[PDB]
């Protein structure tokens, strides 16, 4: 059992090496900074087209269009300034639990219990949205997908693996295999040279899409990690888990900085997102409302409480003007 | 206050019309979540019905459109995607009667049935319970006592008694007997009787859901 115990003997020295860098806590550092005000966002828009629970949404890079997937078999693309439905794509499988909108805006992606990542072309010579590609390599439910560009996409799946595809050929050019539980969430770095994946083994892993290897593992949580998102700097990220706790990990420090939890919250987090400056952490809970946390002081800044069911998805625009919450009550709400 | 935004609004309203029509069409479907602890039994009932992830079988019985979702190809954590089937009309649970001597296997069937029946997502969704391989349990008990699975079972090992004991041992697993019903059928050789039983069980589930919708129950 030599090489079966050298593993935790390396784990002990990883812990001892990342404990020597813990000289002052993020609380001790950001103690003297002024707390944010009372973050009181009023709902500005309500999107009322979906007929079943909404499982995912994603903003466009123009901060106006947004795609949302619901288990009524629909993928609706909304113009959020006017609540106009730009598109309504009917999916081959109603069991969709993720969606992504390409940075160029030409393509959207969806996936779920069918084990397929469907890439839909929005801008065709005809007037309809066409199924551009179907990526069919995963053996477990596909829980997240994120476009790198028009040709590459990274998907996370319930077969405990992530994958980097190229859409033109339809094969996956890289597979990321470190997790031991279902990979539930995925976030791309701002430069798209790295990405974090949070799984059901209560861990997040930092992968690099070029060399296709795991660089760091973060193991602070106690239950399944459902959401993950980089800090806008790209040098940190935040995870939300089923243990009713969000928390911030730093890549360079290789450990945890802050824990965002309250006694009154005993419900898991379904979605996590950062403000444009990164000062506010938006966490969607399944106690029917979203919480706004002071990311630097762990103070609970505000509550967004307009939904009648679980808040399943959350996203802040690229210009930081608004935050869209999609819930299981079949409604999307824009807050500002 | 609108120049060609008017045409975009008209397109959005047409999309809304199409979405409403699709929703009304889908609300007439009967969705059945097909569960079990092995495809040996589940595979023989999809053949009874009219003709890689989730497998949807769409068929029509007596001008009723059933969509039956078999999810046994998902070797993932069930708790992470089972809530997708919260609004399913019914659950068709298939257990084999002949796995009371195999490996312990009947006890795993019970574990799965108890985990599914007592979810927080299936508090109202009733269960159609199929006891498959009626003809193998028929002649197994002559040469294999039932007590290998049920040490506390005191009774003759005749089919009519030993099968009813299993049926009660399964119907005594739901902790909520006032919100859902378990419809139990002993899967028979005949082609049409199983789908007739499913049709009858779905008719009750629809009647009891309508009584709740109309505020009478």
């Amino acid at each position, epitope marked *: 059992d030599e090489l079966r115990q050298e593993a935790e003997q390396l784990k002990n020295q990883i812990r001892d090496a990342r404990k020597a860098c813990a000289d002052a806590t993020l609380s001790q550092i950001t103690n003297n900074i002024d707390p944010v005000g009372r973050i009181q966002m009023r709902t500005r828009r309500t999107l009322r087209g979906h007929l079943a629970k909404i499982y995912a949404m994603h903003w466009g890079t123009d901060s106006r269009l947004l795609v949302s997937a619901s288990q009524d078999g629909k993928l609706i693309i909304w*113009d959020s300034y*006017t609540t106009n439905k*730009v598109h309504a794509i009917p999916l081959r499988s109603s069991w969709v639990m993720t969606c992504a909108y390409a940075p160029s805006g030409n393509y959207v992606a969806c996936g779920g219990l069918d084990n397929i990542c469907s890439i839909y072309n929005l801008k065709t010579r*005809q007037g309809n949205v066409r199924v551009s590609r179907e990526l069919a390599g995963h053996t477990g439910y596909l829980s997240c997908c994120r476009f790198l560009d028009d040709n590459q996409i990274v998907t996370s799946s319930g077969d405990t693996t992530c994958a980097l595809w190229d859409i033109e050929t339809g094969q996956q050019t890289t597979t990321f295999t470190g997790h031991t539980g279902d990979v539930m969430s995925l976030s791309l770095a701002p430069d798209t040279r790295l990405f974090v994946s949070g799984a059901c083994d209560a861990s997040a892993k930092l992968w690099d899409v070029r060399e296709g290897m795991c660089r760091q593992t973060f193991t602070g949580h106690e239950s399944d990690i459902n959401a993950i998102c980089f800090f806008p700097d790209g040098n940190a990220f935040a995870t939300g888990s089923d243990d009713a706790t969000c928390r911030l990990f730093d890549l360079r420090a290789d450990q945890e900085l802050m824990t965002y939890s309250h006694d009154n919250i005993i419900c898991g987090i379904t979605s996590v997102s950062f403000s444009k400056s990164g000062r506010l952490l938006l966490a969607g809970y399944d106690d029917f409302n979203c919480n706004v946390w002071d990311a630097l002081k762990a103070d609970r800044a505000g509550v967004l409480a307009g939904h009648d069911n679980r808040v399943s998805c959350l996203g802040v625009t690229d210009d930081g003007m608004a935050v869209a919450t999609g819930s299981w009550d079949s409604f999307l709400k824009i807050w500002n | *206050l609108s*120049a060609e*935004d008017k*045409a*975009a609004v008209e*397109r959005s309203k047409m999309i809304d019309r199409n979405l409403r029509e699709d929703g009304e069409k889908a609300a007439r479907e009967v969705k059945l979540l097909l569960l079990g602890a092995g495809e040996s039994g589940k595979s023989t009932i999809v053949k009874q019905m009219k003709i890689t992830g989730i497998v949807e079988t769409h068929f029509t019985f007596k001008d009723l459109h059933f969509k039956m979702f078999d999810v046994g190809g998902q070797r993932s954590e069930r708790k992470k995607w089972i809530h997708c089937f919260e609004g399913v009309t019914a659950i068709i649970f298939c257990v084999a009667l002949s796995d009371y001597d195999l490996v312990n296997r009947m006890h795993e069937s019970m574990k799965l049935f108890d985990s599914i029946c007592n979810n927080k997502w299936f508090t109202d969704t009733s269960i159609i319970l199929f006891l498959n391989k009626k003809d193998l349990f028929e002649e197994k008990i002559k040469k294999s006592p039932l007590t290998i699975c049920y040490p506390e079972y005191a009774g003759s090992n005749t089919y009519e008694e030993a099968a009813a004991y299993i049926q009660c041992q399964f119907e005594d697993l739901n902790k909520r007997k006032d919100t859902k019903e378990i419809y139990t059928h002993f899967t028979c050789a005949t082609e049409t009787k199983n789908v007739q039983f499913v049709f009858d069980a779905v008719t009750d589930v629809i009647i009891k859901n309508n009584l709740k919708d109309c505020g009478l129950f």
Partner: single-chain antibody
Amino acid sequence: VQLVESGGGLVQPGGSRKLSCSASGFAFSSFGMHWVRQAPEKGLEWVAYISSGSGTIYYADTVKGRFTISRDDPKNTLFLQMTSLRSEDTAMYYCVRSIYYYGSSPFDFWGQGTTLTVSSSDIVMTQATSSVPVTPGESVSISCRSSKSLLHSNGNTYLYWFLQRPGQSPQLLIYRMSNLASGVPERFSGSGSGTAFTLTISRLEAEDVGVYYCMQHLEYPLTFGAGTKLEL
């Protein structure tokens, strides 16, 4: 994508005709459709419009009452029934597809046109020039001027630039005053503010020669500029 127009021909002044437009290669049901005439040796004149789903219909005041535009989606046909034809309805009629959503490119495809020969508060878009001589390689600017300001409160200016090459149907170059249509080379650039607009060709080729039309889509009836032609 393809639109084929049929039905035109020699008519007596007072008679009636039925022009048809068979669509092919695109989702005809999702596209609003326009009839746009062009009189012999004159410029484009918008005739009629029927929306997707036939829920909205507009006519030019010179054809309101006489012409009726209809649409039968399952066989993908657009109809213009023209009654009480008079000697100045003689023209070539183009069938134009036009889709309207956020970021869409309306007026993107034009049919080949069918010739009709009837025998014997609007926004005024002004193209001050009528014809300019060009040499391949050099840049050129075409100026359009509107009576009302085409800039709207929602931020986008509704100016469209089309090019009609000799012997061909018009081709959309620029939509909403600054956006290049798909398939248009990047030599063309549209600028302007409110009432004065410019189209710039960075370097002329043998395939940029033709008549350039500016159109307003701020409000109906859609009006065109007189058209100024590049020529070698």
